[PDB]
Design a protein around this ligand. Structure first.
Ligand SMILES: *[C@@H]1O[C@H](CO)[C@@H](O)[C@H](O)[C@H]1NC(C)=O
Ligand SMILES: *[C@@H]1O[C@H](CO)[C@@H](O)[C@H](O)[C@H]1NC(C)=O
Ligand SMILES: *[C@@H]1O[C@H](CO)[C@@H](O)[C@H](O)[C@H]1NC(C)=O
Ligand SMILES: *[C@@H]1O[C@H](CO)[C@@H](O)[C@H](O)[C@H]1NC(C)=O
Ligand SMILES: *[C@@H]1O[C@H](CO)[C@@H](O)[C@H](O)[C@H]1NC(C)=O
Ligand SMILES: *[C@@H]1O[C@H](CO)[C@@H](O)[C@H](O)[C@H]1NC(C)=O
Ligand SMILES: *[C@@H]1O[C@H](CO)[C@@H](O)[C@H](O)[C@H]1NC(C)=O
Ligand SMILES: *[C@@H]1O[C@H](CO)[C@@H](O)[C@H](O)[C@H]1NC(C)=O
Ligand SMILES: *[C@@H]1O[C@H](CO)[C@@H](O)[C@H](O)[C@H]1NC(C)=O
Lengths: 39, 25, 50, 148, 87, 327, 148, 49
């Protein structure tokens, strides 16, 4: 009963949101959809 | 084989710099 | 650089050492030997008007 | 030509400026005739150390930069602030001459902004210097089997 | 606006002479010394408003005032070559 | 395709005319910027971050810091003068009488209320509640300071209250000469005479006109809230100043072709012969960025000066009198 | 009194004085005099030393031109306002409050001024007011009589 | 290439500044035109000249 989800990385740009506690809460892919590019 | 969609996962801390209430890119 | 070293209440992470802000400048550093988060702030300055 | 066109409209246009170019050349150098002594600071023997470096003032004379080129190993003749040429027309105010003993390589450290071993404790040049540093690698004179 | 050292703060209210900031104005009044004070917006005049009273003027004074207005500026013209490096 | 408006066709004829038989008093709102945030830059601290060599090298670039400081001081003085000429137009601070019966008109929304310690009206409070480490301290530590205005909010509120008292109790007489008291129904009759309507139309429909005025004031107070863009013209300049400060701060993180935006690492890793050629580019880039900021602030200050002149003209014409200028 | 004209006069004078004084700055070079750079250093180094001075002086001149453009726009706005005031106060009688003076505008008189114009606004300021008892209308035989 | 990049950025900045000045002038002219429209077409102004 084991299963892994191996993925592949690539050079991308991300807009990370840092919380007041110092942790990341959200992120924008910046290249997936036009709304992401607008954000 | 099987495939699965990565629903907004795989984000890590890029550096070792603390930031609070900052939207860094 | 220059700055006043004061005890800060900003909780960091075990792998973080520096600290930035919205202005992209250093405002908090971790002491090397005795682990403690400080708060770097520039000294008092302004404009002299006569 | 100034409007970049072949049809000029009615009006007043400014094109360029007029200047009366010179026709002669005046120098009016001082009446000094005697040459500067460059044999007591280059051909003199028993130069002092780097820390207790001597300093001779050269003034009230003409410095003809022709007898300076007399030794064969006359390399590292780099000028800071001026050029090696065009020195027979400048009329300076004062000229100083010092002497040191470079070990084997510290001649590169005698320059504005260069650091090393002998660069800040014996002789330092700031970033405003105007002169020419020269070394001729005197090895046969200040050396012997018994050591100096 | 900061901290003023060299002038005392009086509780009076005069017209603003030297603007400092945040409603603080300085003046050289009286034992002459520089004093600080909150500027006054003018005299307090309470108009007697009534639902059956009106004020009709019985006289008039012709006043002639002045108003200065700039119209033209000095026309300049620079020489590029002579300014950057002459001769 | 956007529609320009409804398609109407006036029934023009050689013998027909349309005379109105009724009227509806309407109140409109117009926003006008008057002043900006008086800012001042620290030339030595912005270009040089706690560096002695940079400070000694900046002195050879002429007196540009003096030019920038004089420009910012002129902008500040101009904004102060604009505020003064817009608000401070009368030489006497009038007061509202205790009896607040003006023939039926209810000015409880524009007149100041003594309960609020700010001495502002219910409309002014709504306007102030909609126009809004932190950012003002992080930018202050880089030379970008904000000078406070000369006239505080209380003085502007007192000026507005004095103008309202002069308009209600005296009408337009307190703008020309002395304040001459007059009943508000007679003032409204004069206003109606100023647009051709006789006095009987007002003296026979005074209650209806008062009710319409009260309803219009209430509708304006309601429409000031729950609006997507109401105080837009002020938020525009606020966001402009915010973005200007943000880009002026972010230009410090730029390299301008150098190895790094920091000066200490460059001074400690390179030699002065090359450190000078590495730091002069950063100095020139920061100076050019500050000059661009200063000229953009000059353009914006000219815009705000034009807006303040328009606001002063409106304050002198529409408020201190009755203007026949259409629209 | 004549502050608005002296203001722009002193502004232009200070701009010119600053543009002249900017020539004394070195912009990191060895000297502000270009002839000294041409006479001391070799052309390969003289060009590099003079590029900085040329760039600095060109930037200062462009800044001066931009400031002059902004000031000329301000002067154009002021001149448009002055022409409007002329046409509305001298060529007629304007009812705009606080436009042709403080009071009831009767007439104006234009006067020439250095780099400006001075208007002599003649107004009408009432004085010596007296309080009475007013009424909206009266009726004698059951019909209200309103003031014409 | 840094020299070319900086020079072209300065050129674009100068162009944007001149465009802002011209846009402010055209905005003043457009406000004047709108005022003239509202005061001469939508009514009858007694303003001389
Ligand atoms: C941040 O910390 C505070 C207390 O320090 C806590 O109340 C709050 O929930 C935290 N925020 C999180 C975990 O997102
Ligand atoms: C360095 O030494 C001090 C003295 O004992 C100690 O308190 C501190 O924890 C040490 N630092 C680290 C990172 O262990
Ligand atoms: C240099 O000194 C040596 C030794 O005194 C002498 O023989 C020689 O002539 C000198 N040369 C000159 C040019 O003075
Ligand atoms: C008119 O004013 C007087 C005095 O302020 C007041 O007593 C009276 O009630 C007012 N008239 C009306 C109809 O309110
Ligand atoms: C009006 O005032 C002027 C100047 O104060 C005076 O000479 C004149 O007699 C006054 N007229 C009346 C009717 O009071
Ligand atoms: C108005 O007069 C013109 C010409 O006299 C005529 O053609 C037109 O029909 C008239 N209008 C009406 C509504 O009759
Ligand atoms: C005018 O309109 C108001 C509200 O619509 C109404 O109360 C009033 O009777 C009207 N006047 C007339 C019909 O003369
Ligand atoms: C004016 O309106 C407010 C709220 O709309 C109300 O509380 C007040 O009683 C009104 N004034 C009078 C005199 O009725
Ligand atoms: C009106 O003026 C007279 C005399 O100038 C004065 O006695 C009175 O108090 C004023 N006010 C009223 C309401 O009559």
């Amino acid at each position: 009963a084991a299963a892994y989800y191996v993925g592949y990385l690539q050079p991308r740009t991300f807009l990370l949101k840092y919380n007041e506690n110092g942790t990341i809460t959200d992120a924008v892919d910046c290249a997936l959809d036009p709304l992401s590019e607008t954000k | 084989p099987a495939y699965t969609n990565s629903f907004t996962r795989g984000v890590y801390y890029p550096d070792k710099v603390f930031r609070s209430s900052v939207l860094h890119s | 650089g220059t700055g006043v070293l004061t005890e800060s209440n900003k909780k960091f992470l075990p792998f973080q050492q520096f600290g930035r802000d919205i202005a992209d400048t250093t405002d908090a550093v971790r002491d090397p030997q005795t682990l403690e988060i400080l708060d770097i702030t520039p000294c008092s300055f302004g404009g002299v008007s006569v | 030509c100034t409007l970049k066109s072949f049809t000029v409209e009615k009006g007043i246009y400014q094109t360029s400026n007029f200047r009366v170019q010179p026709t002669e050349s005046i120098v009016r150098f001082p009446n000094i005739t005697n040459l500067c002594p460059f044999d007591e600071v280059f051909n003199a023997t028993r130069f002092a150390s780097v820390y207790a470096w001597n300093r001779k003032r050269i003034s009230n004379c003409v410095a003809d930069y022709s007898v300076l080129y007399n030794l064969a190993p006359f390399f590292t003749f780099k000028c800071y602030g001026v050029s090696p040429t065009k020195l027979n027309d400048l009329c300076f105010t004062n000229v100083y001459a010092d002497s040191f003993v470079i070990r084997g390589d510290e001649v590169r450290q005698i320059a504005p902004g260069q650091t090393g071993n002998i660069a800040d404790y014996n002789y330092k040049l700031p970033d405003d210097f105007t002169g020419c540093v020269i070394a001729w690698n005197s090895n046969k004179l200040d050396s012997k089997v018994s050591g100096n | 606006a900061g901290c003023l050292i060299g002038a005392e703060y009086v509780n009076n209210s005069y017209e603003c002479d030297i603007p400092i900031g945040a409603g603080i104005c300085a003046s050289y009044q009286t034992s002459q010394s520089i004093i600080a004070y909150t500027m006054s917006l003018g005299a307090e005049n309470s108009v007697a408003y009534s639902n059956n009273s009106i004020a009709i003027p019985t006289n008039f004074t012709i006043s002639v005032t002045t108003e200065i207005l700039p119209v033209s500026m000095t026309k300049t013209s620079v020489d590029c070559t002579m300014y950057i490096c002459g001769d | 395709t956007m529609s320009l408006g409804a398609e109407n066709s006036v029934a023009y004829s050689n013998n027909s005319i349309a005379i109105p038989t009724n009227f509806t008093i309407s109140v409109t709102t117009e926003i006008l910027p008057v002043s900006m945030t008086k800012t001042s830059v620290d030339c030595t601290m912005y270009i040089c971050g706690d560096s002695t060599e940079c400070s000694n090298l900046l002195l050879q670039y002429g007196s540009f810091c003096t030019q920038l400081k004089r420009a910012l001081t002129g902008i500040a003085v101009e904004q102060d003068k604009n505020t003064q000429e817009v608000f401070a137009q009368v030489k006497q601070i009038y007061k509202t009488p205790p009896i607040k019966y003006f023939g039926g008109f209810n000015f409880s929304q524009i007149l100041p209320d003594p309960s609020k310690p700010s001495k502002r009206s219910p409309i002014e409070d709504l306007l102030f509640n909609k126009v809004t480490r932190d950012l003002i301290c992080a930018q202050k530590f880089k030379g970008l300071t904000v000078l406070p205005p000369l006239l505080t909010d209380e003085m502007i509120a007192q000026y507005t209250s004095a103008l309202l008292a002069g308009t209600i109790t005296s009408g337009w007489t307190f703008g020309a000469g002395p304040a001459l008291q007059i009943p508000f129904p007679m003032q409204m009759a004069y206003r109606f005479n100023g647009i051709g309507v006789t006095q009987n139309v007002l003296y026979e429909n005074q209650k209806l006109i008062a009710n319409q005025f009260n309803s219009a004031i209430g509708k304006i107070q309601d429409s000031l809230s729950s609006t997507p863009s109401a105080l837009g013209k002020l938020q525009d300049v606020v966001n402009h100043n915010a973005q200007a400060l943000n880009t002026l701060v972010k230009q410090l993180s730029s390299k301008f072709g150098a190895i790094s935006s920091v000066l200490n690492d460059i001074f400690s890793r390179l030699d002065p012969p090359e450190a000078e050629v590495q730091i002069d580019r950063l100095i020139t880039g920061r100076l050019q960025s500050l000059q661009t900021y200063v000229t953009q602030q000059l353009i914006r200050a000219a815009e705000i000066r034009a807006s303040a002149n328009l606001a002063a003209t409106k304050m002198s014409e529409c408020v201190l009198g009755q203007s026949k200028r259409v629209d | 009194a004549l502050g608005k004209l002296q203001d722009v006069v002193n502004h232009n004078a200070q701009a010119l004085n600053t543009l002249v004084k900017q020539l004394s700055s070195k912009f990191g070079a060895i000297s502000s005099v270009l002839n000294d750079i041409f006479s001391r250093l070799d052309p390969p180094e003289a060009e590099v030393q003079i590029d900085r001075l040329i760039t600095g002086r060109l930037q200062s001149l462009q800044t001066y031109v931009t400031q002059q453009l902004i000031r000329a726009a301000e002067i154009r706005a002021s001149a448009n306002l002055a022409a409007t005031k002329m046409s509305e106060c001298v060529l007629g009688q304007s009812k705009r409050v606080d436009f042709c003076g403080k009071g009831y505008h009767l007439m104006s008189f234009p006067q020439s001024a250095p780099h400006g114009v001075v208007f002599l606004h003649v107004t009408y300021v009432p004085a010596q007011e007296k309080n009475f008892t007013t009424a909206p209308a009266i009726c004698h035989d059951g019909k209200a009589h309103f003031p014409r």
